């Protein structure tokens, strides 16, 4: 035990020394000459309402028109952003839902929560009905985030301090990502889709390879549990939000923190993080009933969304970036552009 | 003006009607969150991985959820119960040991931001076992709680069956601990409803119904601008 602890301490010291040595300068100095983004006064183009309880997840589709939103009332609504008309309202077996997903092809959707089961629903099928295709079981904790690698693979994260990759046809886990010591509460797929990143409740984030099944890198993280995570459009970086009321940016190659977004006024932790199409505008949601837009390079508050009477829960920009969506506990989903 | 948008509008109207009807049907029931330790006997108070109970009293339905499948870490998933009407918190009063853990759990529940507006209903279970332990006198509550030695019984208080003064004193000290924890940070938004119960007690449902009625009355007072 003593030898293993000494070896771990030596390895951690070596990693910290290498991390500190490889530091040319702060990101602010390099981006000092960059022109400021300017006041981003976004406007609530549309409001969707309809939901009866707190909205807990939201995910834009590839078509950029249909967005699926889950609420703890037991409903999964597939809104059409342009005409604000409901398309499919799926009742849920378990009223407690904390995650939602949309397939890239648009055929399937996924939901999960305290039931510890990743339910899958087929939208486009014969007879024109929404029915549960496959139910994924095996997690010992609450499901927090599920994403579609493809129409046949789903990557999920649970409160069992674990993540899993599933084959829909097989119904069994093909790869188990373990190593976290806290509740993994977020999971964002990389654009290459051969890698992803997961932040856990132990104030840390880990990069994972789906094929290898072993963690590639682990980051120091914030001072508190991580609530949100998002992947930079380039794919070589990712943002992270935690309850320390601060946001951070990490680079896979640098293997260290790059920029910190914080303000003395805000003392409320993050709940949802998203990156714009260009990656210049990092949108974050705060539990003090609003959202803030930050400059990725300049690290300044460009604007505020506001307009929500309760804590925001889900944030997301469309693939083409033509709009953003914010879903809160108000049961109102507001589209800003 | 084309048939596609007309069909979409009809679909939206039908879905909205169904959602409104489902919400109207669901809003009738009152939702409760059962929380307690392993030794508190949480299962038998009212008589996958999350268990549900549904009982009707006075032609009103109560649906109570208890969570056992989580991995001993409630700082994150407890936020899902932000909309429940009440948290039925059960605590083993018989065991002098581990009672500080129950007090700390009650304080953590009370001081949570997302549970601040939520009201709790306290159930001091295994009352008869505590009475038997007090009568035996082998275990002294003074050792675990040194403040009990200077605690006199309230003058206005009086037990119904005329219990032994030692039992009444111990019960009132135990209840006073929880009410002192509650009143420190209650601020008027929520108020605890302490109670004493046994495994054989049958009127727990009526107590829960009355406490929920009081909570809803307070909610209506705060909602109907009656201050």
């Amino acid at each position, epitope marked *: 035990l003593d030898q293993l602890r000494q070896e771990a301490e030596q390895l951690k010291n070596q990693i910290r020394d290498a991390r500190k040595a490889c530091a040319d300068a702060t990101l602010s100095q390099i981006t000092n000459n960059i022109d400021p983004v300017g006041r981003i006064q976004m406007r609530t183009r549309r409001t969707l309402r309809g939901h009866l309880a707190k909205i807990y997840a939201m995910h834009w589709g590839t078509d950029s028109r249909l967005l699926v939103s889950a609420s703890q009332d037991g409903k999964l609504i597939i809104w059409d952003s342009y005409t604000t008309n409901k398309v499919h309202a799926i009742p849920l077996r378990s009223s407690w839902v904390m995650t939602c997903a949309y397939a890239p092809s648009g055929n399937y959707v996924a939901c999960g929560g305290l039931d510890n089961i990743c339910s899958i629903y087929n939208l486009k099928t014969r007879e024109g009905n929404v029915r549960v295709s496959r139910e994924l079981a095996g997690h010992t904790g609450y499901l927090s985030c599920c994403r579609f690698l493809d129409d046949n693979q789903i990557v999920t994260s649970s409160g069992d*301090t674990t993540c899993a990759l599933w084959d829909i046809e097989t119904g069994q886990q093909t790869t188990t990502f373990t190593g976290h*010591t*806290g509740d993994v509460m977020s999971l964002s797929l990389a654009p290459d889709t051969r890698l992803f990143v997961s932040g856990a*409740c*132990d*104030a840390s984030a880990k990069l994972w390879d789906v094929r290898e099944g072993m963690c590639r890198q682990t980051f*120091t*993280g914030h*001072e*508190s*549990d991580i609530n949100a995570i998002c992947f930079f459009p380039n794919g070589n970086a990712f943002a992270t939000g935690s*309850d*320390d*009321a601060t946001c951070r940016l990490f680079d896979l190659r640098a293997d260290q923190e790059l920029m910190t977004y914080s303000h003395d006024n805000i*003392i409320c*932790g993050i709940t949802s993080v998203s990156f714009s199409k260009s990656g210049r505008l990092l949108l974050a949601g705060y539990d003090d009933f609003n959202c803030n837009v930050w400059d990725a390079l300049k690290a300044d508050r460009a604007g505020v969304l506001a307009g929500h009477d309760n804590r925001v829960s889900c944030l997301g920009v469309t693939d083409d970036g033509m709009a953003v969506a914010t879903g809160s506990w108000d049961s109102f989903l507001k589209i800003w552009n | 003006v084309s048939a596609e948008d007309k069909a979409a509008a009809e679909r939206s109207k039908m879905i909205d009607k169904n959602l409104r009807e489902d919400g109207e049907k669901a809003r009738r029931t009152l939702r409760l969150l059962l929380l307690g330790a392993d030794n508190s006997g949480k299962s038998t108070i009212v008589k996958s991985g999350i268990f549900e109970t549904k009982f009707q009293v006075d032609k009103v339905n109560f649906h109570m959820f208890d969570v056992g499948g989580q991995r*001993d*870490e*409630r*700082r994150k998933w*407890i936020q899902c119960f932000n909309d429940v009407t009440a948290i039925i918190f059960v605590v083993d009063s018989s065991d002098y040991n581990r009672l*500080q*853990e129950a007090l*700390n759990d009650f*304080k*953590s*529940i*009370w*001081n*949570n*931001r997302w549970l601040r507006t939520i009201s709790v209903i306290l159930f001091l279970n295994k009352q008869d076992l505590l009475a038997e332990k007090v009568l035996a006198g082998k275990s002294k509550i003074e*050792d*675990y*709680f*040194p*403040e009990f030695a200077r605690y006199t019984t309230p003058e206005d208080a009086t037990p119904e069956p005329g219990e032994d003064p030692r039992v009444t004193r111990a019960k009132y000290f135990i209840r006073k601990e929880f009410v002192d924890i509650s009143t420190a*940070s209650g601020d008027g938004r929520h108020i605890c409803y302490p109670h004493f119960t046994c495994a054989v007690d049958t009127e727990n449902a009526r107590r829960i119904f009355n406490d929920c009625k009081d909570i809803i009355l307070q909610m209506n007072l705060r909602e109907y601008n009656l201050v």
Partner: nanobody, 126 residues
Framework: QVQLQESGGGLVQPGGSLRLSCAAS????????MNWVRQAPGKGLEWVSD????????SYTGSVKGRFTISRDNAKNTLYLQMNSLKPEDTAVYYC?????????????????????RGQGTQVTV
């Protein structure tokens, strides 16, 4: 890495006194409420003492009341626990732990299995 390093502890004769001090690194010390946890052999984790952000509010366990003192130094990012009249039953591993969230009154999982925000602790045998 929100590291918490404890120091002190060891074999102490009954009736003795001892000071256990935990230093903190990686997080702002002042923001977080601090707690102490005991784990006796064949016993589970139990809360024993708590101190708030400013050091004004303070709470003990009834068993250890009148014999344990908790002190918090924001300047040195350290938390000390003085132990007087050490009883033979008070032999345990002490973990100096941090409240999960900053600027937060409630601390849910201070005493729980596999909690990340706590140190390795030090063993005091009496």
């Amino acid at each position: 890495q929100v590291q918490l390093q404890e120091s002190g502890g060891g074999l102490v004769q009954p009736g003795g006194s001892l000071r256990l001090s935990c230093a903190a690194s990686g997080f702002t010390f002042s923001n977080y409420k601090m707690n102490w946890v005991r784990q006796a052999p064949g016993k589970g984790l139990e809360w024993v003492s708590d101190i708030s952000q400013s050091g004004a509010s303070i709470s003990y366990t009834g068993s250890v009341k009148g014999r344990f003192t908790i002190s918090r130094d924001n300047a040195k990012n350290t938390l000390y626990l003085q132990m007087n009249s050490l009883k033979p039953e008070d032999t345990a591993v002490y973990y100096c732990a941090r409240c999960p969230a900053p600027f937060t009154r409630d601390c849910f999982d201070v005493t729980s299995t596999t909690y990340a925000y706590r140190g390795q602790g030090t063993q005091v045998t009496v």
